[PDB]
Write a protein that binds this ligand. Structure first.
Ligand SMILES: Cc1cc2nc3c(=O)[nH]c(=O)nc-3n(C[C@H](O)[C@H](O)[C@H](O)COP(=O)(O)O)c2cc1C
Lengths: 190, 191
């Protein structure tokens, strides 16, 4: 199998990582899958102390959903998705996803070493470049840092970045990106 | 026709605007097409005094190519594509474009009032979100401004943003985004 056949390129691919909880329910969270060669079946992801890492340590199985849905990224950055977000429970396939794939994973020093074993394209799409989508994704990077730090000066700097990206989403984004951004603002206490 | 059927959403859609020069050749430049209702056939673009605007004043015809190709954006940001970038000379499709559209355009003091009249979906695709692609697009916004202005304080601000986005492209982008960023650095005098 080739990573490129499921929407991955070399570089870092921001996807929704779906992993099985101990009770059999799914956990969904954004992660960046790092790819050196998209013609290959190997990749990796460096994971923080979160449910994704805890599940992969136990199960060694990671599903990925390839999606450009700002809302799914915003919600899953701050909490789990509910069953209502899924079009399919097995394999797990969030509504609106363009593709899914399955990786076997081996954790070493906080890095999930991945081997692609299955997947399918669900829906190819066309969308013009949208800076509002870019802005939601960047804001998520800063907001997730913002909530993890106590420094008032560092937080001030991050909030300025978040406001900068908010102006872009308000000007450029579709209603879906604007909705996603309001989730970010709510979650961080703004 | 409906804008949504050719890849446009409400908001601003960054596309490649292709317009006819005085000599019949094509001019290509990134432009944002502003959409209030993607179910409709109407849109707008706000244009500075550039070749796209001058060409629309003469012809009232705007072709749009919907593409996610970082290299097409970077090259067209700083000049014309010429003739090797096109899969079709008429209607102008750029190689790799996902869709093309044709708009009638009425210029009203820098605002192009657009009506969608023709178009085709060429190729639907799938690509995971990539922050390197985001960063190329942001850097192009700042770099096209940088090269057009003389303010020292403003150029200083813009160069800082460009350097910030460069780091994101190096970390996250594919080789295609990296190649696109190399064009930016060359064009701003940091090659
Ligand atoms: C993503 C992006 C969007 C842009 N949108 C616009 C726009 O909507 N209106 C405008 O006047 N310039 C816009 N620009 C700047 C022009 O593309 C740039 O100045 C170019 O040199 C104009 O070329 P032309 O003289 O061939 O029209 C945009 C640039 C980027 C990279």
């Amino acid at each position: 199998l080739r990573l490129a056949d499921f929407g991955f390129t070399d570089g870092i691919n921001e996807i929704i990582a779906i992993t099985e909880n101990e009770d059999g329910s799914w956990n969904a969270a954004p992660i960046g899958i790092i790819v050196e060669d998209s013609s290959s079946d190997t990749a990796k992801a460096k994971l923080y102390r979160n449910r994704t890492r805890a599940n992969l340590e136990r199960s060694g199985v990671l599903f990925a959903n390839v999606t450009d849905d700002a809302l799914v990224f915003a919600v899953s950055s701050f909490g789990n998705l509910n069953d209502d977000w899924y079009a399919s429970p097995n394999p797990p396939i969030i509504k609106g996803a363009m593709a899914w794939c399955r990786f076997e994973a081996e954790m070493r020093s906080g890095v999930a070493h991945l081997k692609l074993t299955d997947g399918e394209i669900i829906e190819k799409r066309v969308r013009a470049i949208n800076r509002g989508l870019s802005a939601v994704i960047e804001a998520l990077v800063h907001a997730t840092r913002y909530v993890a730090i106590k420094s008032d000066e560092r937080r001030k700097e991050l909030l300025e970045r978040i406001h900068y990206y908010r102006e872009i989403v308000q000007k450029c984004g579709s209603e879906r990106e604007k909705r996603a951004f309001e989730i970010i603002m709510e979650k961080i206490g703004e």
